[PDB]
Amino acid sequence: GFKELIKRDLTTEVGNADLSKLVENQIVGHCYRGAFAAVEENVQEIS
Amino acid sequence: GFKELIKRDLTTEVGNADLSKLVENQIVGHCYRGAFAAVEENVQEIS
Amino acid sequence: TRAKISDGKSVRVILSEGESTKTQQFYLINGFFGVAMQDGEKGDEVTLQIEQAEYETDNIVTSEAFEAGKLIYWDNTAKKFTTTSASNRLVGRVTDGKDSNNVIWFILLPQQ
Amino acid sequence: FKGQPTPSTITQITRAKISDGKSVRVILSEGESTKTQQFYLINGFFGVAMQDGEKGDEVTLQIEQAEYETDNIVTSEAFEAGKLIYWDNTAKKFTTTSASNRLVGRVTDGKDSNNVIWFILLPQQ
Amino acid sequence: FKGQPTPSTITQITRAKISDGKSVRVILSEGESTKTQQFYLINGFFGVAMQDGEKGDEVTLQIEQAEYETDNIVTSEAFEAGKLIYWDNTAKKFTTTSASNRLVGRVTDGKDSNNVIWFILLPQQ
């Protein structure tokens, strides 16, 4: 009942830079994911 | 008594990541540099 | 479809019968104050700059010191910048004060 | 690091710029709901909604200060190029009346036949 | 070109946009000082002093009109999302009261339990 949906696991692309400030490219991470949980599978306990 | 410090002689870069539509890719150059002068070495002549 | 159509750095206008603009000069046309990128004639289309950028100009009234930080107001009658703060329109703030050559660096403002 | 062997001190390097500010997330109120690519005034921020918000959820508004195309103008009034635009939060429409509305832009292209305006968004004051 | 062979004539092509203007150099007066990543109002410009300066030194202020994480507020006041932000230069703290203070921003994220705020910076009017 648990499914892991992935389109892009992870992508660290160098971002746009303001050359007029001599600021380096914005390192930015990006992931397109999702999950599908359920209740039929799981049972809670105490201690 | 004269030491020139060359960290980065010259580097020119060009980019149009987020510039205006009417502005072509602007060009920027920069250099890391430093110089140490002194009075231990100089004598000032006239004529 | 997208509401945003352009970055808004430049805006087009149509010259009236009492207006004429030359390249790279400041002109208040139809409520937009900016730097014209084309030499325009009556009833012609030109493009201004509203880039919120630092701008250089010497087209100032040379009577009062433009010390850094003071607001810059554009006087449409005399076609000059000034620090009068009268009914003239507000257009920017001085970044670098006036030099001996009467040159000003100032930041444009969002036309409110 | 939990259970580290030695009490290593931690020094925080200060930082101010958290984002570019092109857009802002906002929480929907009760009597509000947004569809994509339409202007709204939600918690004092005027901008283009980038997501379909229904109720009590989080949506992002675009405050880029760019040039925007928009319908939803009070067609009775005429919007010449250069006139200041105002937002009528009661009617949810653009107007030139400055009674108590929020100043939100200035027109670039005049009111055409299709009631379409091109205008420059303002700094959210 | 001094001593050129020929009397050539030089014609300048005008250029108004000296710089992008996202930041401004400023000189410290006597009663002013700065440290990195702290907000200040220096010579009519409000921004993030990216460098340390004490007396007659040069510092640069970020005026990008981006989103900024500040803290350093008047803790007694409440800062809901969307409320305007004013800089009280006498107390050197942010505040919502508009008595005689400079308007500098609008809160994007409300005052949390540790008095942290995210806000858009405004165009230095």
DSSP for C30-50, please give it.
TTEEEE-SS-B-TT-EEEEE-
Going by their DSSP bridges, the two strands C71-75 and E17-19 should be labelled as unpaired
What residues contact residue E62 under an 8 Å CB cut-off, 6+ apart? D16, D17, E22, E23, E47, E48, E50, E121
First to last CA, chain C: 28
A20 at the E interface (CB within 8 A)?
yes
Resolution for this PDB entry, in angstroms = 3.2
Residue D99 touches partner E, C-beta closer than 8 Å: no
B21/C47 CB distance under 8 A: no
Q: How many CB atoms lie within 10 A of CB D108?
A: 26
Q: How far is E15 from chain D (nearest CA, A)?
A: 23
Q: How far apart (Å, rounded) are the C-alpha atoms in residues B35 and B29?
A: 19
The answer to whether the beta carbons of residues D119 and D112 sit under 8 Å apart is no
Chain A positions touching B26 (Cβ under 8 A) are: 19-20
Q: Is A22 helix (H, G, I), strand (E, B) or coil?
A: coil
Residues C39, C24: Cα–Cα separation, whole Å: 8
The backbone torsions φ and ψ at residue A21, rounded to the nearest 5 degrees and listed phi first, read -105, -5
Measured between CA atoms, how close is B37 to chain C, in angstroms? Answer: 30
Q: Report the gap between the CA of E3 and the closest CA in chain D (Å).
A: 51
Between A and B, how many residue pairs show a Cβ–Cβ distance under 8 A? 14
In single-letter form, the type of residue at position E1 comes to F
Radius of gyration of chain A (CA): 20
Question: Is some CB atom of chain A closer than 8 A to the CB atom of E20?
Answer: yes
DSSP per residue over E17-69, as a string?
Answer: EEE--SEEEEE--TT--B-TTEEEEETTEEEEE-S-B-SS-EEEEE----EEE
A18 with E19: Cβ contact below 8 A: no
**Which of E37, E67, E103 is the closest to D21 by Cβ?**
E67
Rounded CA-CA distance E107/E62 in Å is 18
- Kindly report the number of other CB atoms within 10 A of residue D81's CB atom: 21
DSSP summary character for residue B39 = S
Obtained via which technique?
A: cryo-EM
Neighbours of E67 (CB within 10 A): 22
Q: Determine, for residues E17 and C54 on separate chains, whether the beta-carbon distance falls below 8 Å.
A: yes
What is the C-alpha to C-alpha distance for residues D69 and B26, in angstroms, rounded to an integer? Answer: 28
The one-character DSSP state at A24 is P
Neighbours of C30 (CB within 10 A): 21
Query: How distant, in Å, are the alpha carbons of C12, E64, E89 from that of E45?
Result: 30, 12, 12
Alpha carbons C91 and C28: distance in angstroms, whole number: 10
Among C57, C107, C110, beta carbon nearest to E16: C57
CA distances (Å), origin D73, targets C56, D77, D91: 38, 8, 10
Residue with tokens 């055409």: D112
Which chains, if any, share at least 3 CB pairs under 8 A with chain D? C, E
E positions 71-110 inside 8 Å of A (CB): none
